[PDB]
mmCIF file of C-alpha atoms in Angstrom:
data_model
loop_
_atom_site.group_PDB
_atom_site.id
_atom_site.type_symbol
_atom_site.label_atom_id
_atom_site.label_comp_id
_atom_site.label_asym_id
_atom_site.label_seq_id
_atom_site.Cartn_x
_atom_site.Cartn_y
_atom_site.Cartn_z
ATOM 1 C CA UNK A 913 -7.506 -16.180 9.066
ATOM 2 C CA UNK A 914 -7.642 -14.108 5.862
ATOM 3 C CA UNK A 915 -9.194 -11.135 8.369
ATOM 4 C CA UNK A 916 -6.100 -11.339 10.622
ATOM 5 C CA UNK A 917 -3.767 -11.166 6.759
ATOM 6 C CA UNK A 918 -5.851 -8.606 5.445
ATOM 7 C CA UNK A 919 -5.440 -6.426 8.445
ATOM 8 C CA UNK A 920 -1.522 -7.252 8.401
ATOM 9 C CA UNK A 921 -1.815 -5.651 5.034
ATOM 10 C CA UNK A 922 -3.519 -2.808 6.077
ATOM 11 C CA UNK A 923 -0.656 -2.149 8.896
ATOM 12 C CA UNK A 924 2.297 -3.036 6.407
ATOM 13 C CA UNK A 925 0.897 0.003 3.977
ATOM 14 C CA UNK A 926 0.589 2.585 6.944
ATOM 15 C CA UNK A 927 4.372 1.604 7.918
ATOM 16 C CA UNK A 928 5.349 2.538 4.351
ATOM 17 C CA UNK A 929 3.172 5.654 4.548
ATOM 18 C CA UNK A 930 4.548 6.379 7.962
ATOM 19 C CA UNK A 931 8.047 5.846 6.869
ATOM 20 C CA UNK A 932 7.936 8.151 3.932
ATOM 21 C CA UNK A 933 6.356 10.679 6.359
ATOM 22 C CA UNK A 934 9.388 10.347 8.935
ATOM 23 C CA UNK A 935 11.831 10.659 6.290
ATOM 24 C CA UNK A 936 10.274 13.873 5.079
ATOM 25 C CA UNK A 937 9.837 15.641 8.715
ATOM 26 C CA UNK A 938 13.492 14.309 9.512
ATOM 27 C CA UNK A 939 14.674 16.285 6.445
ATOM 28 C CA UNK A 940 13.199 19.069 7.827
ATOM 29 C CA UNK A 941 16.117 18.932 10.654
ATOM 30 C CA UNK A 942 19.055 19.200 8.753
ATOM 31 C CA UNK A 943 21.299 19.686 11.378
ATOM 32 C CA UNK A 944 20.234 16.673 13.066
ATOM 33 C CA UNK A 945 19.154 17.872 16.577
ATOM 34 C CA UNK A 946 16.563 15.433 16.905
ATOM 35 C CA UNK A 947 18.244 12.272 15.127
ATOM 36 C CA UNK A 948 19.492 10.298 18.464
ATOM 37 C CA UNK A 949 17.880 10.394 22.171
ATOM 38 C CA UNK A 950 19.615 12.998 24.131
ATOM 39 C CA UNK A 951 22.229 11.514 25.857
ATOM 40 C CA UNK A 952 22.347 10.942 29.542
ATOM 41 C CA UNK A 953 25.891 11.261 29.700
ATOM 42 C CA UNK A 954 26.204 14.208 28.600
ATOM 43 C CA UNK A 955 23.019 15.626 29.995
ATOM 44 C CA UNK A 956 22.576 13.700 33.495
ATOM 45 C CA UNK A 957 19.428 15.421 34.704
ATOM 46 C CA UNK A 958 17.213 15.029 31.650
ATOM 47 C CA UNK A 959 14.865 12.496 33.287
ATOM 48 C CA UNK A 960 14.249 15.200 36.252
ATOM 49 C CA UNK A 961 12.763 17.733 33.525
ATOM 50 C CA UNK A 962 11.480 15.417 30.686
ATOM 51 C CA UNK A 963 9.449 12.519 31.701
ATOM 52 C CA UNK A 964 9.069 10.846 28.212
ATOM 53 C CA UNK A 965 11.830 11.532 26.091
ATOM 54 C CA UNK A 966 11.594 11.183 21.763
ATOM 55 C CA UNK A 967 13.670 11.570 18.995
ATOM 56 C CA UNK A 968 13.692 10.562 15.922
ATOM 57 C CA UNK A 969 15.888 7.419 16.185
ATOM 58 C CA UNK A 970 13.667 5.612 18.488
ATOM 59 C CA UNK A 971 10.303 6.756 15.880
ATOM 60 C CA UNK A 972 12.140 4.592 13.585
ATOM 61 C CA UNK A 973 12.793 1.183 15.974
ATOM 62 C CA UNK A 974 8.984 1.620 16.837
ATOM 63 C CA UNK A 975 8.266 2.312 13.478
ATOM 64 C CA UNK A 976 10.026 -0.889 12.000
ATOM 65 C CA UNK A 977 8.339 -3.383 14.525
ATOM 66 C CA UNK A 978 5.301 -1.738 13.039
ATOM 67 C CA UNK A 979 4.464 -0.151 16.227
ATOM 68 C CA UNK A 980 1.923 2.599 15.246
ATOM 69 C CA UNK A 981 -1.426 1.765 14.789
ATOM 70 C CA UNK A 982 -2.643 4.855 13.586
ATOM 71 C CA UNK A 983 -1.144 8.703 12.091
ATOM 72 C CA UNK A 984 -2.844 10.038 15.537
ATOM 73 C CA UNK A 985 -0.089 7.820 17.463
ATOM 74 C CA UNK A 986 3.338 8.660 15.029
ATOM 75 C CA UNK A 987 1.549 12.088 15.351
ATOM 76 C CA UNK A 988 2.138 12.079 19.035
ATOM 77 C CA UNK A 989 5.587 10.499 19.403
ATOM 78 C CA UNK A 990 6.423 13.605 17.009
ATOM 79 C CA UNK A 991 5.031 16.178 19.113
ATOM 80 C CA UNK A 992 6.863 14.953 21.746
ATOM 81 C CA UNK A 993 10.017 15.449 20.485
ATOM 82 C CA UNK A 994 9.412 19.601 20.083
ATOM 83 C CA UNK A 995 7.324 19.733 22.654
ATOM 84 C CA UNK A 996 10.139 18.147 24.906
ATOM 85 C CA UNK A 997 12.872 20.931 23.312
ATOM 86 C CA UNK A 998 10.633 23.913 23.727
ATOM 87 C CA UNK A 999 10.238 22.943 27.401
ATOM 88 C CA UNK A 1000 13.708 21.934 27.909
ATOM 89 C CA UNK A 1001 15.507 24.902 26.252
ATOM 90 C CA UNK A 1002 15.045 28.422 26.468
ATOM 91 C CA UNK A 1003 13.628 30.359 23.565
ATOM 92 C CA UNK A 1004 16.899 31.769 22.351
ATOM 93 C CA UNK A 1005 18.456 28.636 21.965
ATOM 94 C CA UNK A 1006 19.784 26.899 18.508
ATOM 95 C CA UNK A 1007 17.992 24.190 20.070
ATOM 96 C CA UNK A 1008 14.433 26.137 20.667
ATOM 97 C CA UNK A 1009 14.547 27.793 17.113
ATOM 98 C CA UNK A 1010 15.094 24.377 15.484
ATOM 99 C CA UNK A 1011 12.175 22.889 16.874
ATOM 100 C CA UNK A 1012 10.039 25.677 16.078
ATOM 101 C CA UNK A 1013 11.016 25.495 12.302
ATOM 102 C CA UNK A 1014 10.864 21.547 12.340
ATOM 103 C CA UNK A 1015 7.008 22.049 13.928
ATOM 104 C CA UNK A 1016 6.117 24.760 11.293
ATOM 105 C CA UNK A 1017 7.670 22.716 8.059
ATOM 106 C CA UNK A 1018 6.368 19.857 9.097
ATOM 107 C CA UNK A 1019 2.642 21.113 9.651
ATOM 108 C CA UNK A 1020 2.430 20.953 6.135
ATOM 109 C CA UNK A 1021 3.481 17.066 5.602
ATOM 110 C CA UNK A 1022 1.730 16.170 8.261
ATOM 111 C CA UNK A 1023 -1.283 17.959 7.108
ATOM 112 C CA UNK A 1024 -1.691 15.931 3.451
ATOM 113 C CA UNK A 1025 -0.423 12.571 5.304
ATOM 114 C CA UNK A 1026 -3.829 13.332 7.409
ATOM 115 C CA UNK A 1027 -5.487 13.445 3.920
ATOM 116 C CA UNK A 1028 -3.924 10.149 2.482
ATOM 117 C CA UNK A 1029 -4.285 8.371 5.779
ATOM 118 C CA UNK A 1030 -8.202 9.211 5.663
ATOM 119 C CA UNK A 1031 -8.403 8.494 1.616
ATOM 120 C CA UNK A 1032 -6.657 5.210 1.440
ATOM 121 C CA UNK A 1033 -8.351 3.901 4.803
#
């Protein structure tokens, strides 16, 4: 139907929104802590402390199969992935203080995306 395109429209332009947004928090993690899941290899109890893992790897897969519906969903995938590292690794940590400075800077990005997300429908 031309609902069912329109709609398919609608979703394509929040994946471009979305991915300028993840390309903007991601830059906000220059040392790339949060680029790839973290590996259960190298970290073999993970799954006993965090029970839904995120990084910013996987944000993109979903992401590209235009798997968020909404900015409240990307939103939450996001929060996971501090929320996971502030539980995970003890405040004085390289690992802590990066999440707390990727949360803080990207607030602010995630504040006007709120904005555009709202004005462009």
């Amino acid at each position: 139907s031309m609902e069912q395109v329109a709609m398919e429209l609608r979703l394509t332009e929040l994946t471009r929104l979305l991915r300028s947004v993840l390309d903007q928090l991601q830059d906000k993690d220059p040392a790339r802590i949060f680029a790839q899941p973290v590996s259960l290899k190298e970290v073999p109890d993970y799954l006993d402390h965090i029970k839904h893992p995120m990084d910013f790897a996987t944000m993109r897969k979903r992401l590209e199969a235009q798997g968020y519906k909404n900015l409240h969903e990307f939103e939450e995938d996001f929060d996971l992935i501090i929320d996971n590292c502030m539980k995970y690794n003890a405040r004085d940590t390289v690992f802590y203080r990066a999440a707390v400075r990727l949360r803080d800077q990207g607030g602010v990005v995630l504040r006007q995306a709120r904005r555009e997300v709202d004005s462009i429908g």
